[PDB]
């Protein structure tokens, strides 16, 4: 015989303080026992399990499940309890490749490595914890006791230890064959290259020879699976990719669960179908979790759905990544906090698409949302391609310059160019840096009674213009905003406004163009109509004229 | 040569911190660095029985062409036992901040000559990711004291004191202070003499070393010239209503720092409902009150003391045109240091690069003055900072930070 290299075992431990499982074996029918004895006898012959004496105190239950439409039983060793007690492992498959980062391949061959799985030995010192018992016929003899010598299917550590063991085996072959790519998924190896089929088939046989150094055999009747591959919800082809078919159901009525599944499908589709939207459909699940509750579809959601059905009318495919070319990302504003983007290298040939939704918040503006979308696309692009795309953005260079030089926070977007495709992102208002000569000065204030919720808002000006409005069901904060609104409403196109409201200044200095507060939205609407607005802050209750006068009028 | 036993803090597992996305350039640099480190026995490949992780990235030091590996041990440093075994504290040298020149040396390569406790190595695990996760991340752990881990200067301290004994005896007026991977060497000499003494000091470590990739570099500071920012009020011949309003606002803020500040008489000038741009003559009761406030503001703040048991906090404000103001404190309104920058290096069109360079300068000042790093309150959205700060980082340590989402009104008063 030909010596084979052993597969180094991974040392395994139980979590600190914990012991192995001691779980009672369920009674089984005489029929199941006979089937398990036959199954385990074969497993024992193949070296996967070994009979143990009565010293071992651990146990995991074993079951017999009838393979549907067949007289063949199959065994299930239920390791739920051992898994709770087994240490955590490094899990490598946490991040899966995105198809848009893959490279085009001329050939991709599949190799079955299911036999290698049971060549990976289990750490000798851990085997005792995998003990199980076949009950005896009529319970008149001791049950037959076994333990595993190989990685048990269903045990917590088997995926990680199998992956790590195969990686170590494959590393030297990949390193010395930089003209192929190797990928492990389940019990299959996927091998791709740009070589002429002859050289490619040679590499495959050389890989089989390399694997045989560890005694690992691969079926010679080559794999039935061939391009296209159905994988992790995608279809992989040699020179393009897409998502598996997206079929939106027809329904006369929709439940919470149906809408959750619909949005999940739209989200999955949005990575290659441009323009998918889910805002209005997602709004319907706000707060509720009555899985079976029916929700009427708003007219807004019906239009969104209809718009989506059209986008999904026919198949769309992405191309693969060419590292020799720049990556370009283009973004469009869609409305209601929704943004959509495409990443491509050659015009009209997208690698992938995607969307971004406004974060939950009281106040926002388009420039901030565009900025957030850019950072999201940047980070996703680092993951998939290892570098930042050049951006094409619907904002003028002069608009961006004005924004970031005057914004109170540090902010940055990477190399980008203006793309003139409406809706353009713009600054709707900008406050003055200095008081305006010749503009009327409005001293504003508001106050409310915490108990009655009655209040007043108003202003007094240097020209003797005055107004006070009585208010109900209000708060100090709302009356302070109401006073600023009144001054905007009653002033000319240029106006100086003096407030003592730190709350109102906090909001306005954040430069929102849209708010959850209808009062802030009204203030924004007025700001947009002005030519010049200077907002000045003074501390309350300090004898500052104008401020003192109106504070008295509204606090009465 | 023999390992110091090291433990985590009680009831505390190892770090399990996600590796953040790295550019192709940084991955390729780390693969080359780690391949060589593995050959030299500094690191070894690890298996899946090690579930721990600490992030890694790569930087380019101030004025260098070569990538340096930087491990972000912030989580491991929090979870590592405190080191007071052989000593009861290494009092921070209060004189370091008074020298005319302080040079900062990267001496971290020296730590690689001491082995790490075999039972602790698992907790230094890190991963080199692959683009698009197409190949399994490369997993390694340290066999020797790692750069950036708080225990490395502690364990290496004995070795370091003996390496420097001849240089200290022969240069007794020199202040030498070690923080993490840095050596701070302060003197009062002519900078030409200074650089020689520094190169003298390098030779001691190269001599003991028998090569360090970044020991030859030198970050030159001059803490004797570090400026502060007292509260100053305008001196004007013509005060508008708006000017006086701004003055009363600033004085109201200052009165939280200085007890005796008064505004009654200045407010009185704004008796009525006047146009913001109208000029108001100062009556003399107001001129006196203002002079009295000016004199108050020339004195130090009362009851300001440093407590080494409390966190330092650093706040930064963007003032525009490349200017940044900052304050370091432990208790509100009790500033231990204030300052202002404008000369931010090669970042005239990049806010975030400027802020990152300000964070590093403030941290350096904090190390020199108190021997620890402050917790930053940063005027930036989390997602913007986290996407970009690693691109401009040039220091071998990393401070902690939080984010300011609401505009502070006090920016106006530090301008
Ligand atoms: C992630 C991955 C999944 C599968 C297969 C998963 C499954 N099932 C097969 C391979 C070879 C890979 N690895 C890589 C790495 C770099 N480029 C590519 N490009 C590439 C892959 C498949 C097809 C096709 N058809 C075309 C190009 N694949
Ligand atoms: C986790 N699976 C895996 C292991 C080893 C390689 C290698 F080719 F780089 F060696 C590739 C993959 N995909
Ligand atoms: Mg009031």
Q: Sign (positive/negative) of CA torsion B331, B335, B336, B339?
A: positive
Structural domain count, chain B: 4
Nearest to A410 by CA among B349, B336, B299, B286: B349
A270: DSSP letter: T
Can you tell me the distance from the alpha carbon of A509 to that of B412, in angstroms, rounded to the nearest whole number?
12
| B233-236, long-range: CB < 8 A, 24+ apart | B233/B290, B233/B293, B233/B294, B233/B297
Domain that holds residue B253: 221-306
User: Contact, A467 vs A459, CB < 8 A?
Assistant: yes
Contacts of A372 in chain B (CB under 8 A): 381, 383
CB contact under 8 A, B131 and A385: yes
Can you tell me the distance from the alpha carbon of B191 to that of B96, in angstroms, rounded to the nearest whole number?
16
Bridge partners, B186 (sequence order): B102, B175
Can you tell me the distance from the alpha carbon of B377 to that of A404, in angstroms, rounded to the nearest whole number?
20
Can you tell me the distance from the alpha carbon of A370 to that of B206, in angstroms, rounded to the nearest whole number?
52
Cis preceding-peptide flag for A423 (omega within 30 of 0) = yes
Can you tell me the distance from the alpha carbon of B253 to that of B232, in angstroms, rounded to the nearest whole number?
13
Is B182 one of the annotated binding-site residues?
A: yes
Q: Sign (positive/negative) of CA torsion B330, B332, B338, B342?
A: positive
Joined together, the tokens standing for residue B273 give 């409902």
Cis preceding-peptide flag for A228 (omega within 30 of 0) = yes
Contacts of B355 in chain A (CB under 8 A): 410
Can you tell me the distance from the alpha carbon of B127 to that of B54, in angstroms, rounded to the nearest whole number?
8
Joined together, the tokens standing for residue A75 give 């065994």
* Last-in-domain residue among B256, B282, B306: B306
Can you tell me the distance from the alpha carbon of B114 to that of B116, in angstroms, rounded to the nearest whole number?
7
Burial of A417 (0-12, 13-18, 19+ CB in 10 A): exposed
Q: A397: Cβ–Cβ under 8 A, 6 or more apart, which residues?
A: A418
B126 and B235 in a single domain? The answer is no
Q: How far is CA B68 from the centre of its chain?
A: 18
CA angle at residue B212 from B208 to B214, to 5 degrees?
A: 130
Can you tell me the distance from the alpha carbon of A536 to that of A64, in angstroms, rounded to the nearest whole number?
79
B154 and B102 in a single domain? The answer is no
H-helix or E-strand spanning residue A337: none
B129 and B180 in a single domain? The answer is no
Helix, strand, or coil (residue A255)? strand
Can you tell me the distance from the alpha carbon of A547 to that of A459, in angstroms, rounded to the nearest whole number?
9
Helix, strand, or coil (residue A554)? helix
Joined together, the tokens standing for residue A116 give 């290698």
Can you tell me the distance from the alpha carbon of A481 to that of A459, in angstroms, rounded to the nearest whole number?
12
Q: How far is CA A358 from the centre of its chain?
A: 15
Domain that holds residue A467: 441-555
Can you tell me the distance from the alpha carbon of B280 to that of B278, in angstroms, rounded to the nearest whole number?
6
Nearest to B101 by CA among B368, B358, B373: B368
User: Contact, B150 vs B9, CB < 8 A?
Assistant: no
CB contact under 8 A, A87 and B135: no
CA angle at residue B408 from A510 to B275, to 5 degrees?
A: 80
A252: DSSP letter: S
B58 and B154 in a single domain? The answer is yes
B392 and B323 in a single domain? The answer is yes
Q: B35: Cβ–Cβ under 8 A, 6 or more apart, which residues?
A: none
Strand ranges for A309-433 from DSSP E: 328-335, 338-346, 349-357, 363-364, 390-393, 416-418
Nearest to B413 by CA among B328, B317, B288, B337: B317
Q: Give the phi and the psi of residue A358 in degrees, each rounded to 5.
A: -45, 135
Can you tell me the distance from the alpha carbon of A81 to that of B328, in angstroms, rounded to the nearest whole number?
53
Can you tell me the distance from the alpha carbon of B261 to that of B187, in angstroms, rounded to the nearest whole number?
41
Nearest to A419 by CA among A444, A443, A448, A390: A390
Q: How far is CA B63 from the centre of its chain?
A: 19
Q: How far is CA A420 from the centre of its chain?
A: 30
B184 and B326 in a single domain? The answer is no
Can you tell me the distance from the alpha carbon of A65 to that of B169, in angstroms, rounded to the nearest whole number?
81
CB contact under 8 A, B49 and A89: yes
User: Contact, B123 vs B76, CB < 8 A?
Assistant: yes
Q: Give the phi and the psi of residue B329 in degrees, each rounded to 5.
A: -155, 165
Can you tell me the distance from the alpha carbon of A421 to that of A340, in angstroms, rounded to the nearest whole number?
13
Q: Give the phi and the psi of residue A493 in degrees, each rounded to 5.
A: -70, -20
B258 and B215 in a single domain? The answer is no
H-helix or E-strand spanning residue A22: none
Please identify among residues 227-256 of chain B the ones whose CB lies closer than 8 Å to any CB of chain A: 240-242, 245, 248-249, 252
Give A523 Cα–ligand 2 centroid separation in angstroms: 59
Q: Give the phi and the psi of residue B102 in degrees, each rounded to 5.
A: -130, 120
Q: Which of B133, B276, B381 sits opposite A441 (nearest CB)?
A: B276
Judge whether A39 is closer than 8 Å to chain B, CB to CB: no
Q: B255: Cβ–Cβ under 8 A, 6 or more apart, which residues?
A: B261, B262, B263
Joined together, the tokens standing for residue A145 give 């006791």
Joined together, the tokens standing for residue A249 give 């159901």
Tell me, using a 6 A CB cutoff, whether residue A92 lines ligand 2: yes
Contacts of A160 in chain B (CB under 8 A): 48
Can you tell me the distance from the alpha carbon of A126 to that of A115, in angstroms, rounded to the nearest whole number?
22
**Cα dist. B130→A92, A323, B133, B387 in Å?**
11, 15, 5, 18
Nearest to A278 by CA among A254, A295, A259, A256: A259
Burial of A433 (0-12, 13-18, 19+ CB in 10 A): exposed
Can you tell me the distance from the alpha carbon of B133 to that of B127, in angstroms, rounded to the nearest whole number?
12
B312 and B412 in a single domain? The answer is yes
User: Contact, A408 vs A432, CB < 8 A?
Assistant: no
Helix, strand, or coil (residue A183)? strand
The helix/strand count (H/E) of chain A reads as: 14, 23
How long a stretch of residues is chain A? 556
A70 HSE (CA, 13 A, CB side): 7
Please identify among residues 501-520 of chain A the ones whose CB lies closer than 8 Å to any CB of chain B: 502, 505-506, 509-510
B165 and B254 in a single domain? The answer is no
How long a stretch of residues is chain B? 415
Q: What CATH number does the domain containing A539 carry?
A: 3.30.420.10
For chain A, helix, strand, coil in percent to 5 are 30, 25, 45
CA angle at residue A311 from A308 to A315, to 5 degrees?
A: 130
Can you tell me the distance from the alpha carbon of B143 to that of B127, in angstroms, rounded to the nearest whole number?
15
- Would you tell me how many other CB atoms lie within 10 Å of the CB of residue B238? 9
Give A91 Cα–ligand 2 centroid separation in angstroms: 14
- Would you tell me how many other CB atoms lie within 10 Å of the CB of residue B88? 7
Helix, strand, or coil (residue A62)? strand
Give the chain A residue whose CA is nearest to the CA of B407: A506
Tell me, using a 6 A CB cutoff, whether residue A174 lines ligand 2: yes
A4 HSE (CA, 13 A, CB side): 17
Can you tell me the distance from the alpha carbon of A100 to that of B134, in angstroms, rounded to the nearest whole number?
12
Joined together, the tokens standing for residue A411 give 């902010």
Q: Please state the three-class secondary structure of chain B as a single string.
A: CCCCCCCECCCCCCCECCCCCCCHHHHHHHHHHHHHHHHCCCEEECCCCCCCEECEEEEECCCCCCEEEEECCHHHHHHECCCCCCCCCCCCCCCHHHCCEEEEEECHHHHHHCECCCCCHHHHCEEECCHHHCCCCEEEEECECCCCCCHHHHHHHHHHHHHHHHHHHHCCCCEEEEECCEEEEEECCCHHHHHHHHHHHHHHHHHHCCCCCCCCCCEEECHHHCCCCCCCCCCCCCEEHHHHHHHHHHHHHHCCCCCCCCCHHHHHHCCCCCCCCCEECCCHHHHHHHHHHHHHCCCCCCCCCCCCCCCCEEEEEEEECCEEEEEEEEECCEEEEEEEECCCCCCCCCHHHHHHHHHHHHHHHHHHHHCCCCEEEECCCHHHHHHHHHHHCCCCCCCEEEECCCCCCCHHHHC
B16 and B135 in a single domain? The answer is yes
CB environment B383-409: b (16+ within 10 A), e (fewer): bbbebbbbbbbbbbbbbebebbeebbe
Nearest to B181 by CA among B198, B206, B156, B207: B156
Strand ranges for A425-547 from DSSP E: 441-448, 455-461, 466-471, 494-499, 514-515, 532-537
Largest CA distance in chain B: 81
Q: Give the phi and the psi of residue A377 in degrees, each rounded to 5.
A: -65, -40
B22 and B76 in a single domain? The answer is yes
Q: Which of B24, B132, B272 sits opposite A98 (nearest CB)?
A: B132
């Amino acid at each position: 015989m030909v010596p084979i290299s052993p597969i180094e075992t991974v040392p395994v431990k139980l979590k600190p303080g914990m012991d192995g499982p001691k779980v009672k074996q369920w009674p089984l029918t005489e029929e199941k026992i006979k089937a398990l004895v036959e199954i385990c006898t074969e497993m024992e012959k193949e070296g996967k399990i070994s009979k143990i004496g009565p010293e071992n105190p651990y146990n995991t239950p074993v079951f017999a499940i009838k393979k549907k439409d067949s007289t063949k039983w199959r065994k299930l060793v239920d390791f739920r309890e051992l898994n709770k007690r087994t240490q955590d492992f490094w899990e490598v498959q946490l991040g899966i490749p995105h198809p848009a980062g893959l490279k085009k391949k001329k050939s991709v061959t599949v190799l079955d490595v299911g036999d290698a799985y049971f060549s990976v030995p289990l750490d000798e010192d851990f085997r005792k914890y995998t003990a199980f018992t076949i009950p005896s016929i009529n319970n008149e003899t001791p049950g037959i006791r076994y333990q595993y010598n190989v990685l048990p299917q269903g045990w917590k550590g088997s995926p990680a230890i199998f992956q790590s063991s195969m990686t170590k085996i494959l590393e030297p072959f990949a390193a010395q064959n930089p003209d192929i790519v190797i990928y492990q998924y389940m019990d299959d190896l996927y091998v791709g290259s740009d070589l002429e089929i002859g050289q490619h088939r040679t590499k495959i046989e050389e890989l089989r020879q390399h694997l045989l150094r560890w005694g690992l055999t691969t079926p010679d009747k080559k794999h039935q699976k061939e391009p296209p591959f159905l994988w992790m919800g995608y279809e992989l082809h040699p020179d393009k990719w897409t998502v598996q078919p997206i079929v939106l159901p027809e329904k006369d009525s929709w439940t919470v669960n149906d809408i959750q599944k619909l949005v999940g499908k739209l989200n999955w589709a949005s990575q290659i179908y441009p323009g998918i939207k889910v805002r209005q459909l997602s709004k319907l699940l706000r707060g509720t979790k009555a899985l079976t509750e029916v929700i009427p579809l708003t007219e807004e959601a019906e239009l969104e759905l209809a718009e989506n059905r059209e986008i999904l009318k026919e198949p769309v495919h992405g191309v693969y990544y060419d590292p020799s070319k720049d990556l370009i990302a283009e973004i469009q504003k869609q409305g209601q906090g929704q943004w959509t983007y495409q990443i491509y290298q050659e015009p009209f040939k997208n690698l992938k698409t995607g969307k971004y939704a406004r974060m939950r918040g009281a106040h926002t503006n388009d420039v901030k949302q565009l900025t957030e979308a850019v950072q999201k696309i940047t980070t996703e692009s680092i993951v998939i391609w290892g570098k930042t795309p050049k951006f094409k953005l619907p904002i003028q260079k002069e608009t961006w310059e004005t924004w970031w030089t005057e914004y109170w926070q540090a902010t940055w977007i990477p190399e980008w160019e203006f793309v003139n495709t409406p809706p353009l992102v713009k600054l709707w208002y900008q406050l003055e840096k200095e008081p305006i000569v010749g503009a009327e000065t409005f001293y504003v204030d508001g106050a409310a009674n915490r108990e009655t919720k009655l209040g007043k808002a108003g202003y007094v000006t240097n020209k003797g213009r005055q107004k006070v409005v009585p208010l109900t069901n209000t708060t100090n904060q709302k009356t302070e905003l109401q006073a600023i609104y009144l001054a905007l409403q009653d002033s000319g196109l240029e106006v100086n406004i003096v407030t003592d409201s730190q709350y109102a200044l906090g909001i306005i200095q954040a430069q929102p163009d849209k708010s959850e507060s209808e009062l802030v939205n009204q203030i924004i609407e007025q700001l947009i109509k002005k030519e010049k607005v200077y907002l000045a802050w003074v501390p309350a209750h300090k004898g500052i004229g104008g401020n003192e006068q109106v504070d008295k009028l509204v606090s009465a | 040569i023999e390992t110091v036993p090291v433990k985590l803090k009680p009831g505390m597992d190892g770090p399990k911190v996600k590796q953040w996305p790295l550019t192709e350039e940084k991955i390729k640099a780390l693969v080359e660095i780690c391949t060589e480190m593995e050959k030299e026995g500094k690191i070894s490949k690890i298996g899946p029985e090690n579930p721990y992780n600490t992030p890694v990235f790569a930087i380019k030091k101030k004025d260098s062409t070569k990538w340096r590996k930087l491990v972000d041990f912030r989580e491991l440093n929090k979870r590592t036992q405190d080191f007071w075994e052989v000593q009861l504290g290494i009092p921070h040298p209060a004189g370091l901040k008074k020298k005319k020149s302080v040079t900062v040396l990267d001496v971290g390569d020296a730590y690689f000559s001491v082995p790490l406790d075999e039972d602790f190595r698992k907790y230094t695990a890190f991963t080199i990711p692959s683009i698009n996760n197409e190949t399994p991340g490369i997993r390694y752990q340290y066999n020797v004291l790692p750069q950036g881990w708080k225990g490395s200067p502690a364990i290496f301290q004995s070795s370091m004191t003996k390496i420097l004994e001849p240089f200290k005896k022969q240069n007794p007026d020199i202040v030498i202070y070690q923080y993490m991977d840095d050596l701070y060497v302060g003197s009062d000499l002519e900078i030409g003499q200074h650089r020689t003494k520094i190169e003298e000091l390098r030779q001691h470590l190269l001599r003991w070393g028998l090569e360090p990739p970044f020991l030859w570099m030198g970050y030159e500071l001059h803490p004797d010239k570090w400026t502060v920012q007292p509260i100053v009020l305008p001196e004007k011949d013509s005060w508008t209503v708006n000017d006086i309003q701004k003055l009363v606002g600033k004085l109201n803020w200052a009165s939280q720092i200085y007890p005796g500040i008064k505004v009654r008489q200045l407010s009185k000038l704004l008796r009525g409902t006047k146009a913001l741009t109208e000029v108001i003559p100062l009556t003399e009761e107001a001129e006196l009150e203002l002079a009295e406030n000016r004199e108050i503001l020339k004195e130090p703040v009362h009851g300001v003391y440093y407590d080494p048991s409390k966190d330092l906090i650093a706040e930064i404000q963007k003032q525009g045109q490349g200017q940044w103001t900052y304050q370091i404190y432990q208790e509100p309104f009790k500033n231990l240091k204030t300052g202002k920058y404008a000369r931010m290096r090669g970042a005239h069109t990049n806010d975030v690069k400027q802020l990152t360079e300000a964070v590093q300068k403030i941290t350096t000042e904090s190390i020199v003055i108190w021997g620890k790093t402050p917790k930053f309150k940063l005027p930036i959205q989390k997602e913007t900072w986290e996407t970009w700060w690693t691109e401009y980082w040039q220091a071998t340590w990393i401070p902690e930070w939080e984010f300011v989402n609401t505009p502070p009104l006090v920016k106006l008063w530090y301008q």
